Structure 1
Amino acid sequence: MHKVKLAAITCELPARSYENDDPVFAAVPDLSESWWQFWGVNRRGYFDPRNGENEFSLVVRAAERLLRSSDTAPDSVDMLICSASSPIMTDAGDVLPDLRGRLYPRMANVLSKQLGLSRALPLDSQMESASFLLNLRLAASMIRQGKAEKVLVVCSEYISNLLDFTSRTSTLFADGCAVALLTRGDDDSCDLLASAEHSDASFVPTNVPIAMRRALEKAGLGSDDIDYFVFHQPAPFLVKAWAEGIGARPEQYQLTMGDTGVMISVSIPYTLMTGLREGKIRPGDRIVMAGAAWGFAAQVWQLGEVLVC
């Protein structure tokens, strides 16, 4: 009924980065050169709450920057969908100024009031590393069926305060946030062509290609018809296995965990932004975004001009 336009996207990373030899990893045993090559991480960022960095403060900065750059009035936002892998949130801005560590509420209701989204329906979803894809699909359905004209999507990862820095797992994940705006695009070329999810903790390289294959099949396209690919960033060898599994060449996707780490639900949107800002992805390109939760999801997008801010 309506076409879905991915209008703008932005990210906000922590100001402080940590090297693989940073003293914070002094208690981590059995680290090796092969370990860093295996996971492909060289440096990572952790929020510093003492300086005001948390899952909320940086989303406000990114959301306010995106709305200002995209010339979007706050009252014109019809829906706000937020995701956060951490069950703990820590800041509610001026809405609930006295509330600190909390299990509930989540972010959407508080964030909409902080930004003045007086007409926006708030929603908080959880699908782990696939949360960004889930939120884009929810937004797409609302826009497709004429139930919304502007949808603001948020993913915010503040996991560093839960990491056990006596374990090697603490060297893999990092903090970050991403904000994106989807709008009705009947007159423009951008639209969501198709999406797919498949089921079969799970490292099997084939499960993501299966989802990608179904999405292309639903859209009536093949891998050759796709211009660029955007994957989740669990490890270089998995991303490569996904690419080869679907026929994508090394020149048709990026590996971005090197400077950010594995940002769970933010790695995908961050990778999409990087490809756009670096000229890798350009107007008119048809791209595939794929990742895994236990679920696996893929989406085929016909992109127009996307505002990176």
Structure 2
Amino acid sequence: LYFQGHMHKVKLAAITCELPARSYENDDPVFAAVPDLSESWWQFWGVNRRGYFDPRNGENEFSLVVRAAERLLRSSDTAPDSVDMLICSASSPIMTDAGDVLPDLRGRLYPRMANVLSKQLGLSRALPLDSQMEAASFLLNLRLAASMIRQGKAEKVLVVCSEYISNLLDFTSRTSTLFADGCAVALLTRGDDDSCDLLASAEHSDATFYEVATGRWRLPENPTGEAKPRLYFSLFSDGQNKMASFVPTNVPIAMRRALEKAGLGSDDIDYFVFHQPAPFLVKAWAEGIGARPEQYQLTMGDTGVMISVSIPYTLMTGLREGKIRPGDRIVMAGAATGWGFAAQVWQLGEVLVC
């Protein structure tokens, strides 16, 4: 009889995040022009303060990634030329900085980050790739990295998520009160043992409510003077109300599919890492899969909703606080505009937090 082929194990080797220096309270003057603000509104979404990149002080989607990536490569003793692939995601179509690679380039739609960043960091052998799945982009990049590693097409993959969403927020609208900026960097490698692997994942999309949450070129919601059009995050009030039960159930669907592929059940999971859109959404997802409140964290309180960085930040938080331990089997899951849904079942070993 012949022998079965075996995919390489995927090690989640290191992870780090880089958040804005400044925080904004719910009463910060930045929201002075926001209507329909109430104390109940703030309590419902669970955001107490958030951070925005301050470009005047040198903070942008690129500069903070370079700091986070250089710190992770240095702490993990990873030679730049040993990275085989770099996968980046940035939900804001507007980028602002390109470091020393393109010093004269200011606000831009393209190029994206991967190719420029690989040159800034000296990733001389890295295939650059720029993916887009909004809040689920970190899971998408892990899935892509894992498949490349599993099939032997890469041995070290650097994953990057940088969200400069504040440059799309209309501060004359309540839509600007939740989202926030942040960066995340992770390193995935071919495992040398059985301690760490991505057991299974499930991704699916549904464009029924595509028009609900969009990025649209428009004037401010409540402009003043001769306001100029900008690319703004836009919400369709009357469509969002229709999708009542659609996000709460589809993340569990993804989690169920991924656990089914992994041959596991909710009882076999030690901890959960969810996207952080709202406390009621995280609890609905957790209850939809059988997770108890002590099996996951809510992290939007001091950071805000950082789109694709919320998941990696919560993962890092769980690791740093000892709630996620080596040998634990966790599930990572979240939703994204589009809409998209992703879930991953991980066997975790020792993960360097830096």
The structural deviation recorded for 1:34 is 1.1
1:247 to 275, 290, 302: 290
Q: Distance in 1 between matches of 2:164 and 2:72?
A: 20
How do 1:174-253 and structure 2 match up within 5 A? 174-200=180-206, 204-253=247-296
RMSD: 1.1
Asked if structure 2 preserves the Cα contact closer than 8 Å seen for 1:3 and 1:191, the reply is yes
Matched, 1:12 2:18: yes
Q: Which residue of 2 aligns with 1:82?
A: 88
- Specify whether residues 250 and 297 from structure 1 end up closer, same or farther in structure 2 by C-alpha distance, changes over 3 A only: same
TM-score, structure 2 normalization: 0.86
Deviations 1:101-155 (A, max 9, x none): 1111100000000000000000000011010000000000000000000000000
Residue 206 of structure 1 aligns to a residue in which SS?
Answer: helix
Asked if the contact 1:230/1:254 (under 8 Å) is kept, the reply is yes
Question: Are 2:170 and 1:158 aligned?
Answer: no
CA shift at 1:201, angstroms?
8.8
Change (3 A) 1:70 1:252: same
3-state SS of 2:254 partner:
helix
Judge conservation of contact 1:283–1:304 (CA < 8 Å) in 2.
yes
**Residue segments in structure 2 that go unaligned for 5+ positions in a row:** 1-6, 210-246
Give 3-state SS (helix, strand or coil) of 1:205's partner: helix
Q: Determine whether 1:2 maps to 2:8.
A: yes
- The whole-number CA distance in structure 1 between the counterparts of 2:25 and 2:207 is 27
8 Å CA contact retained: 1:7, 1:183: yes
Shift of 1:200: 4.9
Aligned 8 A contact 1:79 1:120 in 2:
yes
Shift of 1:169: 1.0
Which structure's CA Rg is the greater one? 2
Given that 1:198 and 1:210 are in contact with CA atoms closer than 8 Å, whether structure 2 keeps it comes out as no
CA displacement 1:277-305 (0-9 Å, x = unmatched): 01110100000000012111100000000
Relative to structure 1, is the Cα distance of residues 165 and 302 closer, same or farther in structure 2, using a 3 angstrom cutoff?
A: same
Residue by residue over 1:1-39, the C-alpha shift from the partner in whole angstroms, topping out at 9 and shown as x without a partner, is 200000000000000000000111111111111101111
Aligned equivalents of 2:206 and 2:87: distance in 1? 28
Render the CA deviation track for 1:192-234: whole Å, top value 9, x for unaligned: 0000123459893111101100111111111010000000000
The answer to whether the aligner puts 1:284 opposite 2:345 as a matched pair is no
Distance in 2 (CA, whole Å) between partners of 1:228 and 1:22 is 35
Percent identity reads: 99
Deviation larger for 28-37 or 149-158: 28-37
Matched residue SS, 2:135: helix
Look up the SS of the partner of 1:10 in the other structure.
strand
Task: Supply the distance in 2 between the matched residues of 1:108 and 1:238 (Cα, whole angstroms).
Answer: 32
Bigger drift between 141-150 and 30-39 goes to 30-39
Q: Is 1:271 aligned with 2:314?
A: yes
CA shift at 1:186, angstroms?
Answer: 3.3
Q: How many matched pairs?
A: 309
- Preserved CA contact (<8 Å) 1:276 1:282: yes
* Structure-2 change in CA distance of 1:88 and 1:51 (3 Å): same
- Name the structure 1 match of 2:49: 43
Instruction: Name the CA distance, whole Å, in 1 between partners of 2:53 and 2:130.
Output: 22
